[PDB]
Amino acid sequence: VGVNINSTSTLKAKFTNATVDAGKVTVNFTLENANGVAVLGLTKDHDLRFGIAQLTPVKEKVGETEADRGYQWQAYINAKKEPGTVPSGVDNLNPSTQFQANVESANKCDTCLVDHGDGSYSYTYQVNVANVTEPVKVTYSADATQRATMELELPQLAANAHFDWQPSTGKTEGIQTRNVVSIQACYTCHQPESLALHGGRRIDIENCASCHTATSGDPESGNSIEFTYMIHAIHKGGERHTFDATGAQVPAPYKIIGYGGKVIDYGKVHYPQKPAADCAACHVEGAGAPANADLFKADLSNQACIGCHTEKPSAHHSSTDCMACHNATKPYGGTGSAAKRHGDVMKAYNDSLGYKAKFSNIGIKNNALTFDVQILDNKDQPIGKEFISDPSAYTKSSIYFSWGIDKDYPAYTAGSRYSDRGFALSNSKVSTYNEATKTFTIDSTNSNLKLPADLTGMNVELYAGVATCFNKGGYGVEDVVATPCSTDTRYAYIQDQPFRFKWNGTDTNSAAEKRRAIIDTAKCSGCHNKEIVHYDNGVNCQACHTPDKGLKTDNTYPGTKVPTSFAWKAHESEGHYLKYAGVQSGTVLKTDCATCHTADKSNVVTGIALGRSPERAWLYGDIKNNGAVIWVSSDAGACLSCHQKYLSDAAKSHIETNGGILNGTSAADVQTRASESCATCHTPSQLMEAHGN
Template identity: 30%
Template structure:
């Protein structure tokens, strides 16, 4: 929305001239008329300004430092209209200390405060913390431009920390717009006060917010007002410490420790990692689990991104502070006795003597290598053909295994040591692609046909192999089937000639017609790349099933539950259930939606192992279905053919006709919204059922009507109630 302001600066000048005329000197007599004056200036045009903006864009135009800095800036909305109602703003200011003596460069705030411990944590000492400016003045020019004068004279700071003004260094002004229900915006302005230069400066760009948000959705901290890492570092300096915990809040240390969480050596040994924030609120990160390998430093620090030229620093400039943040069981000052084989280290001057290519400890990159994942990149499965796929037949799958890094050279899986006794290579078949159910396969209602490709495959002359299923497709099979190659080659990393290290090679999926004239692929609801934003490459079931959701849904289909892995007596199960649906649409929502659920989502797996996902903390925005889904696949109604999910398999495990099911839409929604009240809403308002059969759904005895309210354009459209932009 916009509104019009009629009085600009020219208007104010005109008003002042009018007052001078009205109240000027006079002797009381009317004088003769003077000559006509020149035509006055035209009234300023009305100014269209923003009202109720959905986004704000601040732009700093200049910073002048003689004593207290003076900042000139503009604020416009998403349409470029001036925003004149700025109620709340914060400014920070820091200088960039250059790298020296092995130290990395570091931001140092000019504005600091002391914090005293309040007895809520183990800290006992008063500490220094960087903060934002206070006591400044904001002048609103009513045209979208503003002037802010700092309350702090940064050229003469002596307490609580003496910070020398060094105008020849890069400086960063941080700006936070938030509060009073206005859209949140952060921006920074890098400049060199000595000459006013703003281009080509060293600005220590080691990570960008987009890398963070690929997993977190949208980081919004400190009440939601800080959303940009470039702003974060202006306060989270090396000298800033939380008094209550005694822990530094230096960004590189704090973020590394948070993300390693429960795997921190200090936590493993029984300690905790916590920071006390606003109003002494404790934030305990001791149970944080990073959903990928902690050694994948490039996930955040992408040296190949032109926007983060300093991201390569983790490889080239190891420091006690950065390395010790993850390896917090090492006391560098004690040398060997402190767990540091390189001897006593009290500064960073000599770190690269050992930590380099050819050095005693090798390069930092080599130390953080994920050997299994890296070696797996030398293998690729290819599905070349599937034949003999009519109902009742034994399908034959022709495939190859190649090295994509060596011009797709073929592997001989019969002789290559990577496919020795500790390797695994399986071919899976499932049907039909409308929604997998696999009834009549002879191996259970929810199981795929799976056979060992290493033992059944026959070599072809062109380097490929053919393997024939040991189980026939049922005579009742219809539609389109799916074929997958999944497994793991083996490697020998320690050189003992035992190939036992599992390599998680990405699984491959293809489709073949059974009774269809041509193969019809299964719907694509989620994107593998979106999963890997957080997970790097999903690798499950002992490293056999990797990075391919289209494989997961073949087994995790609507008929499948964990009944074969659970105690026979439900009373012995951790959740007291006879079984749990592991249909993918329920399983994944149940795992990721733990914070929304009222009941822990517990699944029994291989070897009767118990997996309680009740403590999973989703790092993104749980309501944003587009974090995982593609093409608005989360919208109602669901795709035609989506089956109900089995809640109780009944007396006959191989026969889904006696299953007790939850209807499809309710199966999805109740996996997060699992409360009694939510289920009552679904059954009473949407025709959903938690006690039905697939036959009742197929013959329209049970009809879900959820889409009438929650479908596109409905009064409670999923996209609206989930606040998906």
């Protein structure tokens, strides 16, 4: 007739209805598995807890007036907490008495929970919601929306459930809500486990909001743990700063002190988004978005701003009433609302999404490469050289010519390096600017380019690693627009696809051969947003960062020599493996190859398919012979982008027994002795399972 709770591998809790009788709350809910079969045997002695809160309209008296704060969750269960253990030698703390909302455990009431034997249950709260005054007062209103929450922790799973309803009417639809964000936006950056918080027993956003209330804080740090403030502060991370009385910028890390005085220092957090002002990463709007998704522009909260900017966001700030000056209805002189000012930041990047390069007159003059190039805005109009950016003296807006782009791009040797195939628009030796057409003419004559003997049949590419200058928002600045580069401007890379074709000697109309699918760049962009690190015209890093690219010195690494390949840069990046980095939440784990690599509709990681480029030879350093230049076969070198440092003898023999090379003197040497059969066993599916997926 049903299935026992202590045996079921899946569980779904659903509230059906709720009732309030003179402060007495009774909720009704059902338990079911994935198939929908009733789950029986839930007792009070299971890790079963319940919360109850009101969505209360809040006004705040700020001086001689009241400001609307919208609706805030107020739990009926709160406790007053004096600070427990506070660690010493830890800065940025201010221990003080704080309130904390809580749930009530069912095991405290012998007659509160009823099993109906059919998969449905009824729970009567131990708290009376009619007159809660201490330690935190909640003025009950039957017209106000109430939220019941339940959390359940079993051996095999943890479950949450919530229920919003209006007591006066019994409506669950068409009532005041505070549905702002969705867990799906969080999952764009977060491993689901990294958001299974506390015991791993708290999963749903609605549960978070029910307990992380505006009146709650951490006693041992003195920090607010209000849902909005906390999440903002956390993600501002190491970029959270403030200004003292002298007007100097000082770090303001958000720290939470917990059990035994342990320190979670969110100053260690590095938010991956560039720029970091795009609210939409969490505040998603559109079809299927939460009802109140536009609350981040309602301008009803100062705490919300303070979460990221603190109370002194500049040397010139003195008042803390953020909404008095930063709003849309009646802004302060010289400034604007958050939406507008944050909008100013985004403007340059949003514009650059419509910026592209137009190539023309491609050919050969005196056995040298030549071509014309224009840089277009989002009106399809050319921009002057004054707007073209040179970010540094070593990083310049340049055009990069590539060949063998369907394989692994040109080899890193004299004449075919990124620096040999690149041409800066500001370098008069190779670049000439026509002012009447706003067009650059490039000639490879005065360079170190070693063009292949015959380009016929080759899949070539012209890549525009180009950025454009824009002004910044600020006092009295109404609009952010393209601005000739200066000491006060900022740059943003243009965003287009590299121009690719098959060389025939006559035209650029013949399509080029496609390279294998390796990574899904939309995944890259999901976490990083507009740009990643440098040369951020899309994700075309593999044009410079080749498998045979020169070794780099890293004194913290065995042999003091590390590769510089694209795969290495991504596989080795600290933020891609947050197990012992950051706050160790495992938010990003490189072990999950589907984080970056291409996967089909059936969730098969096709991007890590082996043996698709047998002719490839990687460049590594021998961790024994002081980072001595060695050469590694195709599939092995892909594995050694993570496995090199702690590599065992048996593992080495495993490579070699199966056709692998780990001691080449050259690439040709490798191709001679290489005969890999790795794709027979190490398949995409078994590689995922081997890494814990």
